[PDB]
Amino acid sequence: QAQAQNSQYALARTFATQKVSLEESVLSQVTTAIQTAQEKIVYAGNGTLSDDD
Amino acid sequence: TPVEGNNVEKEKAAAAIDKTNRGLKNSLNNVLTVRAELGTQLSELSTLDSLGS
């Protein structure tokens, strides 16, 4: 009985890790994208830009 | 078009040339905008494929 409990939680941990890693990946890329959008915003602050640029 | 000594042709041609000057300026800006859009496309494609791998 005890062994059965342990095995079931092995499986649960397997699937939890699946989802966790899959999130982390796109989350890192989201950080990247936020940062690039930030940089191009800071360039919008450039006080020499013409309207077409 | 010969314009030697012939007003109404001299200035007429000059006005056509001026209009051409403005037009070329606008055309350059347009094609530069297209270039910029393609540059963003390329950057996205590079970023996306790494994510996929």
State the nearest Cα–Cα gap between A3 and chain B, in angstroms.
Answer: 38
Q: Which residue has the tokens 């001026």?
A: B18
Amino acid (one-letter) located at B36: A
Question: Could you give the dihedral angle defined by the CA atoms of residues A30, A31, A35 and A38, in that order, rounded to the nearest 10 degrees?
Answer: 60
Technique of determination: cryo-EM
Radius of gyration of chain A measured on its C-alpha atoms: 23
User: For chain A, how long is the longest CA-to-CA vector?
Assistant: 74
Cβ atoms of A50 and B26 closer than 8 Å: no
Of B29, B47, B51, the CB nearest to A52: B29
Contacts of A29 in chain B (CB under 8 A): 47, 51
Find the residue in A nearest to B47 (Cα).
Answer: A29
What are the structure tokens assigned to B20, written together?
């051409």
- Stretch (H or E) spanning B43: helix B10-52
Report residue A22: phi and psi, to 5°.
-60, -40
> How far is residue B1's CA from residue B5's CA, in Å, rounded to a whole number?
12
